[PDB]
Amino acid sequence: NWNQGFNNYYDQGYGNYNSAYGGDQNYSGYGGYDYTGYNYGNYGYGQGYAD
Amino acid sequence: NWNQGFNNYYDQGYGNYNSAYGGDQNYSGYGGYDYTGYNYGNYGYGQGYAD
Amino acid sequence: NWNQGFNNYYDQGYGNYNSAYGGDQNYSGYGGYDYTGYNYGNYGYGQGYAD
Amino acid sequence: NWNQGFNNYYDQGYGNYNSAYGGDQNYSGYGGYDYTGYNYGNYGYGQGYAD
Amino acid sequence: NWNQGFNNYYDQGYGNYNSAYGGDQNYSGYGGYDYTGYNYGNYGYGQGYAD
C-alpha cells in the first residue's frame, strides 16, 4: 500500500505528480519561485549550444 | 495498490499528473510562479542555439 | 504501508511528487527560490556545450 | 509502517518527494536559495563540456 | 515504526524527502544557501570534462 493523495489545497497551494509505471522517471526541469532559468540541453541528436 | 487521488482543491489550487505507463517519463519544463524561462534545447535533429 | 499524503497546504504552500514504480528515479533539475540556473547537460547523443 | 506525511505548510512553506519504488534514486540537482548553479554533466552518450 | 512526518512549516521553511524503497539512494547534488556550484560529473557513458 503506497499512498500519496488525500491532500487538501487552499488559496494558491498546488501539487504536481510526475510518475512512471514500469520505467524510469527523469527530472531535469525548473521549480520554485523567483528564479531565472536558461535551457540549453541536448535531448535529441546533435548539440545544445553551438559556440 | 498505488493511490494519488482523493484530493480536494479550493480557490486557485491545482494539480497536474504527468504519467507514463510501461515507459519512461522525462520532465524538462518549468514550474512554480514569478519566474522567467528561456528554452533553447534541442529535441529533434540539429542544434538548439546557433551562435 | 508507506504514507506520503494527508498533507494540508495553505496560502502559497506547495508539494511535488516525482515517483518511479519498478524503476530508477533520476533528479538533475533545480529547486528552491531566488536562484539562477544554467542547463548545458547532455541527455541524448552528442555534446551539451561546444567550445 | 513508514510515514512521511501528515505535514502542515503555511505561508510559503513547501515540500518535495523524490521516490523510487523497487529501484535506486539518484539526486544530482540543486536546492536551497540565493545560489547560482551551472550544469555541465554528461547523462547520455558523449561528453558534457568540450574544451 | 519509522516516523519522519508530523512537521509544521511556517514562513519560508521547507523540507524535501529523497527516498528509495528496496534500493540504494545516491545523493550528489547541492544544498544550502549563498553558494555557487559547478557540475561536471559523468553519469552516463563517456567523460564529464574534456581538457
Author numbering:
A (entry chain D), B (entry chain E), C (entry chain C), D (entry chain B), E (entry chain A): 345 to 395
Pull verbatim passages from the article behind this deposition:
Human heterogeneous ribonucleoprotein D-like (hnRNPDL) belongs to a class of conserved nuclear RNA-binding proteins (RBPs) that assemble with RNA to form ribonucleoproteins (RNPs). hnRNPDL acts as a transcriptional regulator and participates in the metabolism and biogenesis of mRNA1–4. Three isoforms of hnRNPDL are produced by alternative splicing (AS): hnRNPDL-1, hnRNPDL-2, and hnRNPDL-35. hnRNPDL-2 is a 301 residues protein and the predominant isoform in human tissues. A point mutation in hnRNPDL exon 6 causes autosomal dominant limb-girdle muscular dystrophy D3 (LGMD D3), a rare disease characterized by slowly progressive proximal muscle weakness. Here we present the cryo-electron microscopy (cryo-EM) structure of the fibrils formed by the full-length hnRNPDL-2 isoform at an overall resolution of 2.5 Å.
The fibril consists of a single protofilament where hnRNPDL-2 subunits stack along the fibril (Z) elongation axis. The fibril forms a left-handed helix with a full pitch of ~357 Å, a helical rise of 4.82 Å, and a helical turn of −4.86°, featuring a typical cross-β amyloid structure. A molecular model could be unambiguously built de novo for the fibrils core, spanning hnRNPDL-2 residues 226-276 and matching strikingly the region of exon 6 (residues 224-280), which is absent in the non-amyloidogenic hnRNPDL-3 isoform. The fibril core hosts six individual β-strands (β1 to β6) connected by β-turns and loops, yielding a sort of M-shaped fold, with approximate overall footprint of 55 Å x 40 Å. Accordingly, the filament amino acid composition is skewed towards Gly (27%) and Tyr (25%), which comprise >50% of the residues in the structure, and neutral-polar residues, with Asn, Gln, and Ser summing to 32%. Thus, each layer of the amyloid core is essentially stabilized through intra-subunit hydrogen bonds involving buried polar side chains, main-chain peptide groups, and ordered solvent molecules. Additionally, the Tyr aromatic side chains build ladders of π-π stacking interactions along the fibril elongation direction, stabilizing the inter-subunit association interface. Unlike most amyloid structures, the conformation of hnRNPDL-2 residues N226-D276 outlines pores that define two internal water channels. The major of such channels spans the fibril’s entire length and contains additional densities that correspond to two ordered water molecules per layer, that are H-bonded to nearby polar groups of Y239, N241, and with peptide N-atoms of G256. Apart from D259, the fibril core contains three additional exposed Asp residues, D236, D249, and D276, and no positively charged amino acid, which results in a calculated single-layer pI of 3.3 and a highly anionic patch extended along the fibrillar axis.
